[PDB]
Amino acid sequence: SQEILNVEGMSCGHCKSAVESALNNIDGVTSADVNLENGQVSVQYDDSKVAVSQMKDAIEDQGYDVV
Amino acid sequence: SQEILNVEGMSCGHCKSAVESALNNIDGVTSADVNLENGQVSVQYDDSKVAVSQMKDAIEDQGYDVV
């Protein structure tokens, strides 16, 4: 499954790495790709293992806003 | 001694942390304080031990531009 989340506050490569790392530490997330130019975060996942709510919380816990 | 560097590209707390760590790794740098709001980086150092050239290089090696 794929989810595209729109995120505010990611301003550089360090933010990209923080977000991708946080998402990839969740069991069930297969990969994550931040696009800093448009704020889009694309998550590939097993939808029997992880909910989108968990993705949003992981990102917000890193200090960003899911919009 | 005190040096103020003007640095472009620091966008967030991760950038701040990276710049301060790189500077504090240099022998003779006592402390470093990034102001993200104006790009100024204040470095306290022993001017017998460290040159400003070493500070600029450390910053530019982390990917930022020193003015």
Ligand SMILES: [Cu+]
């Ligand atoms: Cu950043």
Ligand SMILES: [Cu+]
């Ligand atoms: Cu950041």
Ligand SMILES: [Cu+]
């Ligand atoms: Cu940053």
Ligand SMILES: [Cu+]
């Ligand atoms: Cu950064």
Ligand SMILES: [Mg+2]
């Ligand atoms: Mg969906």
Ligand SMILES: [Mg+2]
């Ligand atoms: Mg993983």
Ligand SMILES: [Mg+2]
């Ligand atoms: Mg030190």
